[PDB]
Amino acid sequence: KAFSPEVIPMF
Amino acid sequence: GSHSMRYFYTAMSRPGRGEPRFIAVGYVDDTQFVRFDSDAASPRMAPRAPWIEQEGPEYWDGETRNMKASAQTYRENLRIALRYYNQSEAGSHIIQVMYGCDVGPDGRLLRGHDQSAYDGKDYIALNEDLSSWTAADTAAQITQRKWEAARVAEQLRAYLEGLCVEWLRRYLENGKETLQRADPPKTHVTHHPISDHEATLRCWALGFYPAEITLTWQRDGEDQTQDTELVETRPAGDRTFQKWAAVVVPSGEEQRYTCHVQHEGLPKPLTLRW
């Protein structure tokens, strides 16, 4: 199962 | 240690040809088990191995939602990277990401990984501590400062030590017939004359799983590293892999040469000759 952060990290 | 799970994302810009394409693929060891492609008629996380098909609708809906949201975020990252490298909006660029966990025989975390690249060059990597970052240049340093402020390393660590290992352990059980079976290589030496004075000896390994293998030629018991042509391990298409190693030998001297084969599937290393 893939990593699923609440807010996905932007560059 | 015994096993790995890895996800690979690629996001590819293509100005004038729609929004950047996002492709995601997941592996356990050398077995692919899922895919997502934003260009598909109906993009969804889709099964690529038998032992994952049994996951229910909530699994598949959740992975699909995640990949769609990831595709959106990686489109924004491509726009951002353009600004950080003073680049024009006319060129085509690529972001890639690899992340996942390694576990030992008892299934505990051996190490975690999270690395990113821009245009095929290292950009930013989570260090083995799962707490600090290595940025490759001053652009990635900007990303590092943002990720440090937002405690991204902590989120990755929670996933790598928790869900990543737990789901890997579950896949390894559900797929135990294949994921926990090594197939040893089938091996032989072939002989191809080149002139009256020389011939090639080619040592073959076929039908093996996992991909990891060592094939080496010795002449009079001495490794021929500098004089061996060794091809990249290649997939057969049936889950298994193939490799060969070759040496050019003087006519009549073939018996001085021995091929040595190491593979997890073999109870001991093999020595072959023509």
């Binding site: - | 693929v25 692919q32 492609d37 890639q96 690899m98 060059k121 997939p235």
Partner: protein, 99 residues
Amino acid sequence: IQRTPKIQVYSRHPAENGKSNFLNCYVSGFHPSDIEVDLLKNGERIEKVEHSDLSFSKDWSFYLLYYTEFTPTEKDEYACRVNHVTLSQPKIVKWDRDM
């Protein structure tokens, strides 16, 4: 800074004339990812060709397997034809059953 593909052309199983098999063209070590691969039967394009999902190695370079069912014979010649941004013209690699 871009990377040209390596190309291997080979069969899934040892070749045996009149026995059905799979013809593989493995492209690897390339960057960027767009690539054109055709499998050829006597210089002509085979239509039913599938490929693996795009993935990449630890050095960030891409790899793909292109594959099709085939029954090798003594005279039929097979090849894989690859184009990539790094190549001024397509590269044709002949299938040699011994490699």
